[model samples]
Target: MASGVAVSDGVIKVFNDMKVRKSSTPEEVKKRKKAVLFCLSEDKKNIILEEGKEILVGDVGQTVDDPYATFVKMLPDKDCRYALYDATYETKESKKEDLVFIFWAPESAPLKSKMIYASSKDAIKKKLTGIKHELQANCYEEVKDRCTLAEKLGGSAVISLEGKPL
Candidate 1:
């Protein structure tokens, strides 16, 4: 069931840039956004870009030592939010960067809010094409760090294509 919430065009543009844009220089990469956070509009009728929540590559070490930690802290204790993260990790072969779509709905959030976010999620996901990973976090520990994400990426076992543990 859909929540009838519309994803904003601006959000789509940002997601596209995050997915396809390439940075050739260290400076360019450093200035690039590491994650883009999204929230439902105040009216709850649309999904809109949330301000001052975008994590820039330079913010790592400058504002925050770990971008993932910063992204976690940005999640409200009693609210829901959607995010696109540039997850960087290493496998047995090489270093890899993947676009991760995150759905954050804490158990403490209002039931109605949780329902709306859940129903509206697919609408946004449809627009964020080429996402390599999808993370649904209900608690902090599940997404505490890169290692946790690495586990989801097969550091331990494979996550089913359905985005569920087999």
Candidate 2:
């Protein structure tokens, strides 16, 4: 079965239990900045969220040309894996958001398993289940996969992939 996605208080608990700095804010609890989540153990304590003062850039000095592309890429070994969640308003009436969590065996990890998460905010406040619920419930293909030409990929894309061994 395809995994069911949820953005309920359960999600908030997940953040609080980890004590990520953003957990105290309603925004990170509901409208969290898109970020990569990583873990290397069965222990929830191993979970890691992006660390830095700014959402668009981190302490490591990475940068993306588009402010919207803020994200963290991934990798795996044992329980080491990565995940992401986000929200956005394409227009006054259009909104978007999603959570893509992946667990990979060390042998199966994609080239770096580097995946950039998207940023988000608003509209789904009334529904705690969040964009995951909205997308699956509405049954709309509003989210489509677009291929970025390999040549077009640049430093912003690569720097975001920096994942440390856990």
Candidate 3:
């Protein structure tokens, strides 16, 4: 069952611009927005951008030092939200960037809110293209920092038989 919540045109425009737009100058790249937070409209009939919630890359040098931490702090303690994050990280091979789609439905939130957000998820998800990772977090600990997310994307594992090293 879907909530029939429509994603606003403005939301789509912002998302597309953030997803594909390139910065030619160093300052533009440095001050570019790194994440956007979205939420259901007051009537709960549409998905809209949460005003003043955009996270810029330059935010790190200001009051907060970690952009990811700032993003996490923006999530409501007892509410549901959808967010797009530009994740830049480094692995054993090379540096990489990925667009992460986050679904925030904290366990402390009301069941009705969770249900609506859950059902209406596809409305926004389908509209968003080029999402590399989808994250459904129910608590702060699950999405505490970038290192935790790096671990999820890494997916490095070893298999052994009879408790012996592979």
Candidate 4:
């Protein structure tokens, strides 16, 4: 008879990171494993909503660009290993907004590992529908090749989440 059990002590040890909860409520309780979660304020968005505000997106493709260098410096913890989210503009049915984000996760993390985001307000002009990938891929690419291409534009894309980190 065969015993049914999965084993990978090595993987477990590497991902033994501590928890850093979201402000007040502790949203980081979501179990990120090798991932970390951070919060962002809507103030940056508000700035973009202001008159004549400017934001930059690095050159991604000749047709694409992601300038998250301005953002990589934005986070507080400074452990923003990679940018999983990128900046973009969104036009809601009710309004127009400029947005930027950060997506973070570490190697050996679970496939479902939560990616934390530090988002800036509406400034980027990328359309919400088609150009969304430009923001996501710009920050972080799971595959190696596209990631290299994205790096040519910036570090990585940032993601956004309304909930708190675990």
Candidate 5:
């Protein structure tokens, strides 16, 4: 006799929901891409990116919002370097200069982390392990919510994966 598979209600709910949803936003949609804020090992040292100017982790920097674009953009081309990151979004925090803690994927992240502060997906996590940053996981989640109003007219899956965003 065969046994039935066990599934949690939450998991089943999400799996069924995706069947009716369309992941991609319309191309015509023009929203300001966000910058996720991530801090360095110490306070006040976060990765900063300028509008229209792309930061090349490897060499051929993928477009700002396109994580995979940055990653894959590095490879396959004669000039770009290989980068493996996740998602890229916009920053919604006030321009005031303050030391803030945000989530960085260092790899691809689910649809959660985003907002005033952006983080680094690929930290030399190797450099520090179990080293606690000032913010807790809860703060990270809260910030992700604040950035919701910001628009994501365009995004890069490849760019994100290369950058390792969540």
Candidate 6:
């Protein structure tokens, strides 16, 4: 089979249900353009932009209600780092802040210990693995919902391989 960056049903769904801000300014658009959150895919060239975008005249850092943009924007130029990751709409959680975990390319993700969070499509699993490990080590005992890692720690996180969240 030929390799390609095909959009998932989850992603297409997000685009279909996506809600954008009613108004936006040049600065707001410029900032979003600079962020450039997405995956590069196996080809290492094609980009799959994260779903959800709210171009508004307000602060660029303002949070949106969409899952894709929420996590992708957390790291700028994510596409330059990752290859494949879960579609936002595929997340099992109901809250946006509780999302975490991702798959990393072999090079982008070292053959170290198994990971519980971050990367794909050239994205650095290394980065999120460390975070997940630390969170697990520190809060596992106190947390009741292991599924909600972000909530276990505090809130807000990533998506990693095997669709494991951090």
The model with the greater lDDT, 1 or 3, is 1
Between prediction 5 and prediction 6, which has the larger TM-score? Answer: 6
Task: For each candidate in turn, give its C-alpha RMSD to the true structure in angstroms.
Answer: 5.7, 13.1, 6.9, 18.5, 19.7, 14.3
> Candidate 5, 153: how far from true, in Å?
28
lDDT of 6 at 53: 30
TM-scores of all candidate predictions against the true structure: 0.80, 0.30, 0.80, 0.20, 0.17, 0.20
In model 5, where is the ten-residue run with the lowest total lDDT? 77-86
The global C-alpha lDDT for each of the candidates, from Candidate 1 onward, is 0.69, 0.28, 0.68, 0.25, 0.25, 0.29
lDDT of 2 at 24: 53
Error of 1 at 141 (Å): 0.8
Model 6 reaches what TM-score against the true structure? Answer: 0.20
Local accuracy of candidate 5 as per-residue lDDT tens digits, 1-166: 2212222233223223222222346431222221222122222223222223222222323335533233222222111111112123333422111112223322222222222122323332222233222222222233233222111212322222222342
Residue-by-residue lDDT tens digits, candidate 3, 1-166: 5456777778887888678635778767667677788888877778788888888865666565677777778887687888877666554566445666777778778765777777777777667754667777887877664555555355243121101211
| Model 4: residues with Cα > 4 Å off, grouped in runs | 1-54, 58-66, 78-101, 104-166
True-vs-predicted CA distance for residue 24, candidate 5, Å: 39
Model 2 pairs in collision: 73-115, 87-120
Which lDDT tens digits does candidate 6 get at residues 1-166? 2233333333333322222222267554423321123344344423344543322212223543333333334433211222121222123454232222232222233222112112232223322233232221212132223344343334334343113333
- Looking at model 5, residue 46 earns an lDDT score of 32
Candidate ordering by TM-score (highest first): 1, 3, 2, 6, 4, 5
Query: Model 2: per-residue lDDT, tens digit, 7-95?
Result: 33333444443223354564344434443343322222222333441232222233444323332222213222333333222222333
Q: Residue 108 in model 2: shift from native, Å?
A: 2.6
* Candidate 2 weakest lDDT stretch, 10 residues: 136-145
Global CA lDDT computed for model 6:
0.29
What are the per-residue Cα lDDT tens digits for candidate 1 across 1-166?
Answer: 5456877788887777778645778767667777788888877768788878887766665766666778788887577888877665555556456667777778778765677777777777777754578887888877564556655456543332112212
RMSD, candidate 2, Å = 13.1
